[PDB]
Amino acid sequence: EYKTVIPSPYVKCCGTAECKDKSLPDYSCKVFTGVYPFMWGGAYCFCDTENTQLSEAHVEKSESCKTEFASAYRAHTASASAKLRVLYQGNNVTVSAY
Protein backbone atom coordinates (compact mmCIF):
# COMPACT_ATOMS: atom_id res chain seq x y z
CA GLU A 1 0.00 0.00 0.00
CA TYR A 2 1.33 3.40 -1.03
CA LYS A 3 1.10 6.77 0.67
CA THR A 4 0.59 10.26 -0.71
CA VAL A 5 3.09 12.83 0.56
CA ILE A 6 1.50 16.28 0.75
CA PRO A 7 3.77 19.06 2.02
CA SER A 8 2.26 22.20 3.44
CA PRO A 9 0.60 24.31 0.73
CA TYR A 10 2.41 27.49 -0.23
CA VAL A 11 0.01 30.43 -0.39
CA LYS A 12 1.42 33.68 -1.78
CA CYS A 13 0.04 36.83 -0.18
CA CYS A 14 0.40 38.72 -3.46
CA GLY A 15 1.00 37.60 -7.03
CA THR A 16 1.09 34.21 -8.68
CA ALA A 17 3.29 31.40 -7.38
CA GLU A 18 5.34 29.43 -9.89
CA CYS A 19 4.84 25.72 -10.48
CA LYS A 20 8.03 23.68 -10.16
CA ASP A 21 8.88 20.24 -11.54
CA LYS A 22 10.27 17.09 -9.95
CA SER A 23 10.97 13.47 -10.87
CA LEU A 24 9.02 11.94 -7.99
CA PRO A 25 7.11 8.73 -8.78
CA ASP A 26 3.70 10.36 -9.22
CA TYR A 27 4.51 14.02 -8.71
CA SER A 28 1.71 16.44 -9.54
CA CYS A 29 1.70 20.19 -8.98
CA LYS A 30 -1.06 22.73 -9.52
CA VAL A 31 -1.55 26.45 -8.91
CA PHE A 32 -4.95 27.70 -7.77
CA THR A 33 -5.65 31.42 -7.98
CA GLY A 34 -8.03 33.75 -6.20
CA VAL A 35 -7.82 31.93 -2.86
CA TYR A 36 -8.44 33.72 0.43
CA PRO A 37 -7.46 31.41 3.29
CA PHE A 38 -8.57 31.99 6.87
CA MET A 39 -6.52 31.06 9.91
CA TRP A 40 -7.81 30.85 13.46
CA GLY A 41 -7.01 34.48 14.25
CA GLY A 42 -7.83 36.23 11.01
CA ALA A 43 -7.28 36.25 7.28
CA TYR A 44 -3.87 34.86 6.41
CA CYS A 45 -3.42 36.92 3.25
CA PHE A 46 -3.29 40.70 3.35
CA CYS A 47 -5.32 41.51 0.22
CA ASP A 48 -8.80 40.18 -0.48
CA THR A 49 -7.75 38.70 -3.83
CA GLU A 50 -4.74 38.03 -6.10
CA ASN A 51 -3.63 35.25 -3.72
CA THR A 52 -2.52 32.00 -5.32
CA GLN A 53 -2.01 28.72 -3.46
CA LEU A 54 0.68 26.29 -4.62
CA SER A 55 -0.53 22.75 -3.96
CA GLU A 56 1.80 19.85 -4.69
CA ALA A 57 1.84 16.16 -3.85
CA HIS A 58 3.44 12.86 -4.79
CA VAL A 59 3.33 9.23 -3.69
CA GLU A 60 5.88 6.94 -2.04
CA LYS A 61 5.98 3.52 -0.42
CA SER A 62 4.44 3.41 3.03
CA GLU A 63 6.22 2.30 6.19
CA SER A 64 4.21 -0.93 6.35
CA CYS A 65 5.79 -2.06 3.08
CA LYS A 66 8.52 -3.74 5.14
CA THR A 67 6.00 -6.12 6.75
CA GLU A 68 2.72 -5.90 4.82
CA PHE A 69 3.47 -6.72 1.19
CA ALA A 70 2.74 -9.24 -1.54
CA SER A 71 5.46 -10.91 -3.60
CA ALA A 72 4.95 -11.66 -7.30
CA TYR A 73 7.11 -14.56 -8.47
CA ARG A 74 7.55 -16.94 -11.39
CA ALA A 75 7.59 -20.72 -10.95
CA HIS A 76 10.20 -22.24 -13.25
CA THR A 77 10.52 -25.87 -12.18
CA ALA A 78 10.08 -27.75 -8.93
CA SER A 79 12.95 -29.69 -7.35
CA ALA A 80 11.08 -32.63 -5.88
CA SER A 81 12.07 -33.93 -2.45
CA ALA A 82 10.67 -36.83 -0.48
CA LYS A 83 10.74 -38.52 2.92
CA LEU A 84 10.00 -42.22 3.27
CA ARG A 85 9.52 -44.89 5.92
CA VAL A 86 10.66 -48.43 5.12
CA LEU A 87 10.46 -51.53 7.30
CA TYR A 88 14.06 -52.47 6.50
CA GLN A 89 15.04 -55.68 8.31
CA GLY A 90 11.75 -55.62 10.20
CA ASN A 91 12.44 -52.28 11.91
CA ASN A 92 11.02 -48.88 11.01
CA VAL A 93 13.68 -46.63 9.52
CA THR A 94 13.23 -43.30 7.78
CA VAL A 95 14.85 -42.10 4.56
CA SER A 96 14.96 -38.48 3.42
CA ALA A 97 16.20 -37.75 -0.09
CA TYR A 98 15.58 -35.72 -3.20
Place this chain on the structure above:
Amino acid sequence: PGQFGDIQSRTPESEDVYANTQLVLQRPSAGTVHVPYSQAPSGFKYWLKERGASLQHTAPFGCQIATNPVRAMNCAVGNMPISIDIPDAAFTRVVDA
Protein backbone atom coordinates in the same frame (compact mmCIF):
# COMPACT_ATOMS: atom_id res chain seq x y z
CA PRO B 1 -4.94 2.20 -10.97
CA GLY B 2 -7.15 0.56 -8.40
CA GLN B 3 -6.38 -2.98 -9.50
CA PHE B 4 -3.59 -5.11 -8.09
CA GLY B 5 -0.20 -3.54 -8.66
CA ASP B 6 -0.89 0.18 -8.92
CA ILE B 7 2.41 0.67 -7.08
CA GLN B 8 5.31 -1.68 -7.78
CA SER B 9 8.83 -2.03 -6.39
CA ARG B 10 11.65 -4.45 -7.15
CA THR B 11 12.59 -5.19 -3.53
CA PRO B 12 11.08 -4.02 -0.23
CA GLU B 13 14.24 -1.97 0.38
CA SER B 14 14.47 -0.60 -3.17
CA GLU B 15 14.11 3.13 -3.69
CA ASP B 16 12.75 3.17 -7.24
CA VAL B 17 8.95 3.24 -7.11
CA TYR B 18 6.52 3.10 -10.02
CA ALA B 19 3.05 4.25 -9.02
CA ASN B 20 0.03 4.82 -11.27
CA THR B 21 -2.81 6.06 -9.06
CA GLN B 22 -3.99 9.06 -11.16
CA LEU B 23 -3.48 11.52 -8.33
CA VAL B 24 -5.32 14.72 -9.30
CA LEU B 25 -5.38 17.77 -7.06
CA GLN B 26 -8.48 19.90 -6.54
CA ARG B 27 -9.22 23.49 -5.65
CA PRO B 28 -9.21 24.50 -1.97
CA SER B 29 -12.74 24.84 -0.65
CA ALA B 30 -13.80 28.39 0.16
CA GLY B 31 -11.26 29.90 2.50
CA THR B 32 -9.37 26.97 3.96
CA VAL B 33 -5.73 25.95 3.78
CA HIS B 34 -6.17 22.22 3.12
CA VAL B 35 -4.94 20.37 0.04
CA PRO B 36 -7.65 18.16 -1.52
CA TYR B 37 -7.01 15.46 -4.09
CA SER B 38 -8.78 12.68 -5.98
CA GLN B 39 -6.68 9.52 -6.01
CA ALA B 40 -7.63 5.94 -6.76
CA PRO B 41 -7.56 3.91 -3.52
CA SER B 42 -4.88 1.33 -2.88
CA GLY B 43 -5.04 -1.65 -5.18
CA PHE B 44 -3.56 -3.88 -2.50
CA LYS B 45 -6.01 -2.83 0.21
CA TYR B 46 -8.60 -3.82 -2.41
CA TRP B 47 -6.98 -7.10 -3.39
CA LEU B 48 -6.79 -8.13 0.26
CA LYS B 49 -10.58 -8.09 0.51
CA GLU B 50 -11.01 -9.48 -3.01
CA ARG B 51 -8.45 -12.30 -2.70
CA GLY B 52 -10.69 -15.33 -2.79
CA ALA B 53 -9.50 -18.78 -1.92
CA SER B 54 -5.80 -19.53 -2.27
CA LEU B 55 -4.19 -22.64 -3.70
CA GLN B 56 -4.12 -24.18 -0.23
CA HIS B 57 -7.85 -24.85 -0.65
CA THR B 58 -8.40 -24.98 -4.43
CA ALA B 59 -5.44 -27.03 -5.68
CA PRO B 60 -6.20 -30.48 -7.12
CA PHE B 61 -4.98 -33.97 -6.23
CA GLY B 62 -5.31 -33.24 -2.52
CA CYS B 63 -2.40 -30.81 -2.67
CA GLN B 64 -1.16 -29.00 0.42
CA ILE B 65 0.62 -25.65 0.18
CA ALA B 66 3.22 -24.14 2.49
CA THR B 67 5.50 -21.10 2.48
CA ASN B 68 9.11 -20.26 3.37
CA PRO B 69 9.90 -21.68 0.84
CA VAL B 70 6.78 -22.25 -1.31
CA ARG B 71 6.11 -25.98 -1.59
CA ALA B 72 3.43 -28.46 -2.58
CA MET B 73 3.26 -31.43 -0.25
CA ASN B 74 1.61 -34.83 -0.62
CA CYS B 75 0.37 -34.36 -4.17
CA ALA B 76 -1.30 -37.54 -5.39
CA VAL B 77 -0.31 -37.45 -9.08
CA GLY B 78 1.88 -40.10 -10.65
CA ASN B 79 3.96 -42.91 -9.18
CA MET B 80 7.33 -43.02 -7.45
CA PRO B 81 10.18 -45.04 -9.02
CA ILE B 82 12.09 -46.22 -5.96
CA SER B 83 15.35 -48.10 -6.49
CA ILE B 84 17.06 -49.82 -3.57
CA ASP B 85 20.57 -51.26 -3.21
CA ILE B 86 20.10 -54.08 -0.70
CA PRO B 87 23.46 -55.51 0.44
CA ASP B 88 24.19 -59.23 0.44
CA ALA B 89 24.33 -59.25 4.24
CA ALA B 90 20.69 -58.14 4.37
CA PHE B 91 19.42 -61.36 2.78
CA THR B 92 19.39 -64.67 4.62
CA ARG B 93 20.38 -67.81 2.74
CA VAL B 94 17.50 -70.00 1.59
CA VAL B 95 18.68 -73.05 3.53
CA ASP B 96 18.70 -70.92 6.69
CA ALA B 97 15.02 -70.03 6.31
Place this chain on the structure above:
Amino acid sequence: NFNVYKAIRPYLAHCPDCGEGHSCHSPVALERIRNEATDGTLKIQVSLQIGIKTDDSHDWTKLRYMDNHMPADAERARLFVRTSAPCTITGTMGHFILARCPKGETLTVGFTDGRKISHSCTHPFHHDPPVIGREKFHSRPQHGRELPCSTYAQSTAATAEEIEVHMPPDTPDRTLMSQQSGNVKITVNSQTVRYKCNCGDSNEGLTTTDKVINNCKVDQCHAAVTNHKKWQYNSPLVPRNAELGDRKGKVHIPFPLANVTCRVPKARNPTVTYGKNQVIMLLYPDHPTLLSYRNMGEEPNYQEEWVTHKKEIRL
Protein backbone atom coordinates in the same frame (compact mmCIF):
# COMPACT_ATOMS: atom_id res chain seq x y z
CA ASN C 1 12.20 9.08 24.60
CA PHE C 2 10.73 12.58 24.33
CA ASN C 3 14.06 14.34 23.71
CA VAL C 4 13.02 15.52 20.25
CA TYR C 5 9.71 16.93 21.47
CA LYS C 6 11.38 19.90 23.20
CA ALA C 7 11.81 21.92 20.00
CA ILE C 8 8.29 21.44 18.61
CA ARG C 9 4.86 22.62 19.70
CA PRO C 10 1.24 21.73 18.84
CA TYR C 11 -0.84 23.70 16.36
CA LEU C 12 -4.43 24.63 15.60
CA ALA C 13 -5.70 23.45 12.23
CA HIS C 14 -8.96 23.26 10.31
CA CYS C 15 -11.47 20.59 11.31
CA PRO C 16 -14.41 19.70 9.04
CA ASP C 17 -16.89 18.97 11.84
CA CYS C 18 -16.30 20.11 15.43
CA GLY C 19 -19.09 18.05 16.95
CA GLU C 20 -22.04 20.16 15.79
CA GLY C 21 -22.03 20.09 12.00
CA HIS C 22 -19.78 23.13 11.63
CA SER C 23 -16.11 23.59 10.79
CA CYS C 24 -13.72 25.55 12.99
CA HIS C 25 -10.03 25.46 13.81
CA SER C 26 -9.37 23.15 16.73
CA PRO C 27 -6.33 21.90 18.65
CA VAL C 28 -7.42 18.32 17.95
CA ALA C 29 -7.35 18.63 14.16
CA LEU C 30 -7.03 15.01 13.11
CA GLU C 31 -4.24 14.51 10.60
CA ARG C 32 -3.98 10.96 9.28
CA ILE C 33 -5.41 7.56 10.22
CA ARG C 34 -3.43 4.50 9.18
CA ASN C 35 -4.79 0.98 9.54
CA GLU C 36 -2.06 -1.25 8.16
CA ALA C 37 -2.31 -3.61 11.15
CA THR C 38 -4.28 -6.71 10.19
CA ASP C 39 -5.41 -7.21 13.79
CA GLY C 40 -7.55 -4.07 13.70
CA THR C 41 -5.49 -1.56 15.65
CA LEU C 42 -5.26 2.06 14.50
CA LYS C 43 -2.57 4.73 14.65
CA ILE C 44 -4.11 8.21 14.78
CA GLN C 45 -2.01 11.32 14.20
CA VAL C 46 -3.50 14.38 15.88
CA SER C 47 -2.33 17.96 16.36
CA LEU C 48 -2.14 17.43 20.12
CA GLN C 49 0.98 16.33 21.96
CA ILE C 50 0.46 13.74 24.68
CA GLY C 51 2.82 12.72 27.46
CA ILE C 52 4.76 15.99 27.54
CA LYS C 53 3.79 19.06 29.56
CA THR C 54 4.22 22.69 28.54
CA ASP C 55 7.67 22.93 30.16
CA ASP C 56 8.79 20.03 27.94
CA SER C 57 9.15 17.73 30.96
CA HIS C 58 7.82 14.28 30.07
CA ASP C 59 4.75 13.26 32.09
CA TRP C 60 2.48 10.41 31.05
CA THR C 61 -0.53 11.95 32.83
CA LYS C 62 -0.68 15.19 30.81
CA LEU C 63 -0.97 16.50 27.27
CA ARG C 64 -0.23 19.90 25.77
CA TYR C 65 -2.14 21.71 23.05
CA MET C 66 -1.94 25.03 21.23
CA ASP C 67 -4.20 27.61 22.87
CA ASN C 68 -4.20 30.75 20.71
CA HIS C 69 -0.47 31.55 20.78
CA MET C 70 0.89 29.66 23.79
CA PRO C 71 0.67 25.89 24.40
CA ALA C 72 -1.34 24.92 27.48
CA ASP C 73 -1.83 21.78 29.57
CA ALA C 74 -4.64 19.26 29.85
CA GLU C 75 -5.14 15.92 31.56
CA ARG C 76 -4.69 12.72 29.58
CA ALA C 77 -7.59 11.05 31.39
CA ARG C 78 -10.12 13.13 29.45
CA LEU C 79 -8.64 12.18 26.08
CA PHE C 80 -11.08 9.98 24.20
CA VAL C 81 -11.37 8.45 20.75
CA ARG C 82 -14.74 7.23 19.48
CA THR C 83 -15.91 5.73 16.20
CA SER C 84 -19.41 4.41 16.91
CA ALA C 85 -18.88 3.28 20.52
CA PRO C 86 -16.15 4.36 22.93
CA CYS C 87 -12.76 2.96 21.96
CA THR C 88 -9.92 1.63 24.08
CA ILE C 89 -6.71 3.65 23.85
CA THR C 90 -3.72 1.31 24.04
CA GLY C 91 -0.92 3.86 23.71
CA THR C 92 -0.12 7.56 23.36
CA MET C 93 3.15 9.30 22.50
CA GLY C 94 3.26 12.91 21.38
CA HIS C 95 1.20 13.24 18.21
CA PHE C 96 0.24 9.57 17.86
CA ILE C 97 -2.52 7.50 19.43
CA LEU C 98 -3.18 3.79 19.27
CA ALA C 99 -6.74 2.58 19.68
CA ARG C 100 -8.82 -0.56 19.23
CA CYS C 101 -12.16 0.60 17.91
CA PRO C 102 -15.49 -1.02 17.07
CA LYS C 103 -16.66 -1.13 13.48
CA GLY C 104 -18.06 2.14 12.22
CA GLU C 105 -18.13 4.60 9.35
CA THR C 106 -16.72 7.65 11.14
CA LEU C 107 -14.05 8.49 13.69
CA THR C 108 -13.75 11.23 16.30
CA VAL C 109 -11.17 12.12 18.93
CA GLY C 110 -11.31 14.80 21.58
CA PHE C 111 -10.38 15.99 25.05
CA THR C 112 -11.41 18.46 27.75
CA ASP C 113 -9.80 21.89 28.00
CA GLY C 114 -8.23 23.32 31.12
CA ARG C 115 -11.10 25.82 31.18
CA LYS C 116 -13.55 22.86 31.20
CA ILE C 117 -14.21 23.33 27.47
CA SER C 118 -14.68 20.29 25.22
CA HIS C 119 -12.90 19.95 21.89
CA SER C 120 -13.35 17.25 19.27
CA CYS C 121 -12.78 16.59 15.58
CA THR C 122 -14.81 14.01 13.66
CA HIS C 123 -13.67 12.55 10.36
CA PRO C 124 -15.30 10.23 7.84
CA PHE C 125 -13.45 6.93 8.02
CA HIS C 126 -14.70 3.50 6.95
CA HIS C 127 -13.33 1.26 9.68
CA ASP C 128 -13.88 -2.43 9.05
CA PRO C 129 -11.07 -4.69 10.27
CA PRO C 130 -10.27 -7.49 7.84
CA VAL C 131 -11.25 -11.01 8.78
CA ILE C 132 -8.39 -13.15 10.07
CA GLY C 133 -8.90 -16.80 9.28
CA ARG C 134 -12.08 -18.39 8.00
CA GLU C 135 -14.55 -17.31 10.73
CA LYS C 136 -15.85 -13.79 11.29
CA PHE C 137 -15.63 -13.69 15.08
CA HIS C 138 -16.02 -10.67 17.35
CA SER C 139 -13.91 -11.34 20.45
CA ARG C 140 -10.96 -13.59 21.12
CA PRO C 141 -12.21 -16.86 22.62
CA GLN C 142 -11.09 -19.06 25.48
CA HIS C 143 -10.27 -21.98 23.17
CA GLY C 144 -9.06 -21.81 19.59
CA ARG C 145 -5.98 -21.70 17.40
CA GLU C 146 -3.37 -19.08 16.53
CA LEU C 147 -2.85 -17.26 13.24
CA PRO C 148 -0.26 -14.65 12.24
CA CYS C 149 -1.15 -10.97 12.07
CA SER C 150 0.41 -7.52 12.25
CA THR C 151 0.21 -5.07 15.12
CA TYR C 152 1.44 -1.63 16.07
CA ALA C 153 3.78 -2.61 18.89
CA GLN C 154 3.84 -0.66 22.14
CA SER C 155 7.51 0.30 21.83
CA THR C 156 7.85 4.08 21.94
CA ALA C 157 11.54 3.73 21.00
CA ALA C 158 10.84 5.43 17.71
CA THR C 159 12.97 4.20 14.81
CA ALA C 160 13.08 3.69 11.03
CA GLU C 161 10.30 6.17 10.16
CA GLU C 162 10.24 9.95 10.50
CA ILE C 163 7.94 12.91 9.95
CA GLU C 164 9.49 16.22 8.98
CA VAL C 165 9.19 19.44 10.96
CA HIS C 166 9.25 22.98 9.64
CA MET C 167 9.26 26.55 10.80
CA PRO C 168 5.74 27.69 11.68
CA PRO C 169 4.31 30.32 9.35
CA ASP C 170 3.18 33.72 10.53
CA THR C 171 0.10 33.47 12.72
CA PRO C 172 -2.41 36.16 11.70
CA ASP C 173 -4.34 37.51 14.67
CA ARG C 174 -6.47 40.65 14.41
CA THR C 175 -6.79 40.77 18.20
CA LEU C 176 -3.27 42.23 18.36
CA MET C 177 -4.34 45.42 16.57
CA SER C 178 -6.71 47.39 18.77
CA GLN C 179 -8.03 50.69 17.45
CA GLN C 180 -7.95 53.99 19.34
CA SER C 181 -9.11 57.31 17.86
CA GLY C 182 -9.49 55.38 14.62
CA ASN C 183 -5.81 54.45 14.84
CA VAL C 184 -4.07 51.09 15.13
CA LYS C 185 -1.54 50.54 17.89
CA ILE C 186 -0.66 46.80 17.77
CA THR C 187 -0.43 45.72 21.41
CA VAL C 188 2.24 43.12 20.52
CA ASN C 189 2.13 41.59 24.03
CA SER C 190 5.89 40.95 24.34
CA GLN C 191 6.04 38.75 21.21
CA THR C 192 7.42 39.77 17.83
CA VAL C 193 4.77 40.66 15.25
CA ARG C 194 4.81 41.73 11.61
CA TYR C 195 2.53 44.58 10.55
CA LYS C 196 1.41 46.14 7.28
CA CYS C 197 -1.00 49.00 6.66
CA ASN C 198 -3.03 50.23 3.70
CA CYS C 199 -2.62 53.89 4.67
CA GLY C 200 -0.86 56.38 2.42
CA ASP C 201 2.58 55.79 3.95
CA SER C 202 2.24 52.05 3.19
CA ASN C 203 4.32 51.41 6.30
CA GLU C 204 5.39 47.86 7.12
CA GLY C 205 8.04 46.02 9.07
CA LEU C 206 8.83 43.93 12.11
CA THR C 207 8.21 45.35 15.58
CA THR C 208 8.58 44.16 19.17
CA THR C 209 6.80 46.92 21.12
CA ASP C 210 3.56 48.87 20.92
CA LYS C 211 3.57 51.01 17.78
CA VAL C 212 0.68 53.42 17.19
CA ILE C 213 0.05 54.40 13.57
CA ASN C 214 -2.28 57.40 14.10
CA ASN C 215 -3.37 57.21 10.45
CA CYS C 216 -4.41 53.69 9.43
CA LYS C 217 -7.89 52.32 10.08
CA VAL C 218 -8.37 49.06 11.96
CA ASP C 219 -9.68 47.29 8.86
CA GLN C 220 -6.84 48.69 6.71
CA CYS C 221 -4.00 46.90 8.53
CA HIS C 222 -2.76 43.36 9.14
CA ALA C 223 -0.76 42.14 12.14
CA ALA C 224 0.67 38.64 12.45
CA VAL C 225 3.04 37.07 14.96
CA THR C 226 6.22 36.40 13.02
CA ASN C 227 9.06 35.14 15.23
CA HIS C 228 8.77 31.47 16.13
CA LYS C 229 11.44 29.52 18.00
CA LYS C 230 9.62 26.18 18.20
CA TRP C 231 9.07 24.09 15.09
CA GLN C 232 6.05 22.06 14.03
CA TYR C 233 5.07 19.34 11.60
CA ASN C 234 4.36 20.62 8.09
CA SER C 235 0.71 19.69 8.23
CA PRO C 236 -0.94 19.64 4.78
CA LEU C 237 -3.55 22.02 6.24
CA VAL C 238 -1.40 24.87 7.56
CA PRO C 239 0.22 27.35 5.15
CA ARG C 240 3.88 26.93 4.32
CA ASN C 241 6.42 29.38 5.71
CA ALA C 242 7.84 30.22 2.26
CA GLU C 243 8.47 28.56 -1.10
CA LEU C 244 10.88 26.21 0.70
CA GLY C 245 11.04 24.57 4.11
CA ASP C 246 13.53 25.66 6.76
CA ARG C 247 14.54 24.92 10.37
CA LYS C 248 13.88 21.30 9.51
CA GLY C 249 14.31 18.08 11.44
CA LYS C 250 13.02 14.55 11.66
CA VAL C 251 10.86 13.30 14.52
CA HIS C 252 10.99 9.52 14.65
CA ILE C 253 7.41 8.41 15.28
CA PRO C 254 6.50 5.55 17.63
CA PHE C 255 4.61 2.25 17.47
CA PRO C 256 6.34 0.30 14.69
CA LEU C 257 4.38 -2.34 12.81
CA ALA C 258 5.42 -5.55 14.51
CA ASN C 259 4.00 -8.96 13.62
CA VAL C 260 2.44 -11.36 16.10
CA THR C 261 0.07 -14.32 16.26
CA CYS C 262 -3.63 -13.73 16.94
CA ARG C 263 -6.10 -16.23 18.37
CA VAL C 264 -9.13 -17.32 16.35
CA PRO C 265 -11.99 -19.65 17.34
CA LYS C 266 -12.66 -23.11 15.97
CA ALA C 267 -16.18 -23.97 14.87
CA ARG C 268 -17.83 -26.81 16.76
CA ASN C 269 -18.06 -30.24 15.21
CA PRO C 270 -20.83 -30.67 12.63
CA THR C 271 -23.21 -33.59 12.95
CA VAL C 272 -22.48 -36.00 10.09
CA THR C 273 -24.63 -38.81 8.73
CA TYR C 274 -23.62 -40.96 5.79
CA GLY C 275 -25.54 -41.81 2.66
CA LYS C 276 -24.41 -43.83 -0.33
CA ASN C 277 -21.68 -41.64 -1.84
CA GLN C 278 -23.00 -38.81 0.33
CA VAL C 279 -22.29 -37.04 3.59
CA ILE C 280 -25.07 -35.15 5.36
CA MET C 281 -23.58 -32.38 7.48
CA LEU C 282 -25.56 -30.34 9.99
CA LEU C 283 -23.64 -27.15 10.75
CA TYR C 284 -23.87 -25.05 13.93
CA PRO C 285 -22.19 -21.69 13.22
CA ASP C 286 -22.01 -19.16 16.05
CA HIS C 287 -20.86 -16.40 13.67
CA PRO C 288 -20.47 -16.20 9.88
CA THR C 289 -18.36 -19.26 9.15
CA LEU C 290 -16.88 -20.38 5.83
CA LEU C 291 -17.38 -23.91 4.51
CA SER C 292 -15.32 -25.17 1.58
CA TYR C 293 -14.92 -28.51 -0.13
CA ARG C 294 -13.05 -29.86 -3.13
CA ASN C 295 -12.59 -33.17 -4.90
CA MET C 296 -9.24 -34.75 -4.18
CA GLY C 297 -8.69 -35.87 -7.76
CA GLU C 298 -7.77 -34.24 -11.06
CA GLU C 299 -10.79 -31.93 -11.03
CA PRO C 300 -11.20 -30.22 -7.63
CA ASN C 301 -14.56 -28.53 -8.30
CA TYR C 302 -14.02 -26.05 -5.49
CA GLN C 303 -17.13 -24.56 -3.89
CA GLU C 304 -17.53 -22.31 -0.86
CA GLU C 305 -20.20 -20.45 1.07
CA TRP C 306 -20.45 -18.44 4.29
CA VAL C 307 -22.95 -20.27 6.50
CA THR C 308 -24.45 -17.63 8.78
CA HIS C 309 -27.00 -19.87 10.52
CA LYS C 310 -27.73 -23.53 11.14
CA LYS C 311 -27.86 -25.45 7.88
CA GLU C 312 -27.93 -28.97 6.49
CA ILE C 313 -25.62 -29.63 3.55
CA ARG C 314 -25.30 -32.70 1.34
CA LEU C 315 -21.95 -33.35 -0.34
Place this chain on the structure above:
Amino acid sequence: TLTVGFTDGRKISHSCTHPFHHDPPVIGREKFHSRPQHGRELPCSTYAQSTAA
Protein backbone atom coordinates in the same frame (compact mmCIF):
# COMPACT_ATOMS: atom_id res chain seq x y z
CA THR D 1 -35.72 4.53 19.61
CA LEU D 2 -35.23 7.81 21.43
CA THR D 3 -34.57 8.29 25.14
CA VAL D 4 -34.07 11.51 27.09
CA GLY D 5 -33.35 11.87 30.78
CA PHE D 6 -31.72 13.83 33.57
CA THR D 7 -30.30 13.31 37.06
CA ASP D 8 -32.44 14.68 39.86
CA GLY D 9 -31.27 16.97 42.64
CA ARG D 10 -31.60 13.93 44.92
CA LYS D 11 -29.03 12.07 42.77
CA ILE D 12 -31.81 10.08 41.07
CA SER D 13 -31.86 9.39 37.33
CA HIS D 14 -35.11 9.71 35.40
CA SER D 15 -35.51 8.76 31.75
CA CYS D 16 -38.19 8.23 29.12
CA THR D 17 -38.02 5.98 26.06
CA HIS D 18 -40.27 6.26 23.06
CA PRO D 19 -40.00 4.23 19.85
CA PHE D 20 -39.00 6.64 17.11
CA HIS D 21 -37.66 5.55 13.72
CA HIS D 22 -34.90 8.10 13.23
CA ASP D 23 -33.30 7.84 9.79
CA PRO D 24 -32.39 11.26 8.41
CA PRO D 25 -33.04 11.77 4.70
CA VAL D 26 -30.13 11.71 2.28
CA ILE D 27 -29.07 15.05 0.83
CA GLY D 28 -27.82 14.84 -2.68
CA ARG D 29 -26.83 11.61 -4.36
CA GLU D 30 -24.37 10.12 -1.84
CA LYS D 31 -25.19 8.44 1.46
CA PHE D 32 -22.32 9.98 3.38
CA HIS D 33 -21.99 9.94 7.17
CA SER D 34 -19.91 12.91 8.34
CA ARG D 35 -19.46 16.18 6.51
CA PRO D 36 -16.18 16.27 4.57
CA GLN D 37 -13.43 18.82 4.10
CA HIS D 38 -14.06 19.05 0.35
CA GLY D 39 -17.33 18.90 -1.54
CA ARG D 40 -20.22 20.98 -2.82
CA GLU D 41 -23.06 22.75 -1.05
CA LEU D 42 -26.73 21.86 -1.50
CA PRO D 43 -29.78 23.57 0.02
CA CYS D 44 -31.36 22.07 3.11
CA SER D 45 -33.36 23.04 6.19
CA THR D 46 -32.38 23.29 9.85
CA TYR D 47 -33.86 24.40 13.14
CA ALA D 48 -32.22 27.76 13.79
CA GLN D 49 -30.56 28.34 17.15
CA SER D 50 -32.52 31.57 17.66
CA THR D 51 -34.91 31.58 20.61
CA ALA D 52 -36.67 34.76 19.40
CA ALA D 53 -39.92 32.83 19.53
Place this chain on the structure above:
Amino acid sequence: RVPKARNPTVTYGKNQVIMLLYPDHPTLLSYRNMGEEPNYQEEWVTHKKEIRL
Protein backbone atom coordinates in the same frame (compact mmCIF):
# COMPACT_ATOMS: atom_id res chain seq x y z
CA ARG E 1 -21.89 20.54 2.36
CA VAL E 2 -21.95 17.13 0.69
CA PRO E 3 -18.99 15.09 -0.63
CA LYS E 4 -18.02 14.32 -4.21
CA ALA E 5 -16.90 10.86 -5.25
CA ARG E 6 -13.46 9.96 -6.58
CA ASN E 7 -12.96 10.18 -10.32
CA PRO E 8 -13.80 6.90 -12.07
CA THR E 9 -11.15 5.22 -14.20
CA VAL E 10 -12.66 5.55 -17.66
CA THR E 11 -11.47 3.45 -20.59
CA TYR E 12 -13.11 3.45 -24.00
CA GLY E 13 -14.16 0.60 -26.26
CA LYS E 14 -16.03 0.35 -29.56
CA ASN E 15 -19.23 2.23 -28.68
CA GLN E 16 -18.50 1.46 -25.04
CA VAL E 17 -17.18 3.27 -22.00
CA ILE E 18 -15.75 1.19 -19.16
CA MET E 19 -15.68 2.57 -15.63
CA LEU E 20 -14.16 1.47 -12.36
CA LEU E 21 -15.93 3.11 -9.44
CA TYR E 22 -14.43 3.75 -6.00
CA PRO E 23 -17.23 4.63 -3.60
CA ASP E 24 -16.37 5.53 -0.02
CA HIS E 25 -20.10 5.18 0.71
CA PRO E 26 -23.26 4.19 -1.18
CA THR E 27 -23.15 6.37 -4.28
CA LEU E 28 -25.75 6.83 -7.02
CA LEU E 29 -24.88 6.24 -10.68
CA SER E 30 -27.28 7.60 -13.29
CA TYR E 31 -27.04 7.54 -17.05
CA ARG E 32 -29.29 8.20 -20.02
CA ASN E 33 -29.14 8.59 -23.77
CA MET E 34 -29.36 12.11 -25.13
CA GLY E 35 -31.80 11.20 -27.91
CA GLU E 36 -35.55 10.86 -28.15
CA GLU E 37 -35.73 7.97 -25.68
CA PRO E 38 -33.48 8.65 -22.68
CA ASN E 39 -33.66 5.04 -21.46
CA TYR E 40 -32.83 6.32 -18.00
CA GLN E 41 -31.21 3.82 -15.67
CA GLU E 42 -29.70 4.08 -12.21
CA GLU E 43 -28.02 1.99 -9.55
CA TRP E 44 -26.72 2.40 -6.00
CA VAL E 45 -23.11 1.21 -5.97
CA THR E 46 -21.81 0.28 -2.53
CA HIS E 47 -18.38 -1.19 -3.31
CA LYS E 48 -15.85 -1.19 -6.14
CA LYS E 49 -17.61 -2.02 -9.39
CA GLU E 50 -16.78 -2.46 -13.07
CA ILE E 51 -19.38 -0.87 -15.34
CA ARG E 52 -19.75 -1.16 -19.12
CA LEU E 53 -22.11 1.39 -20.69
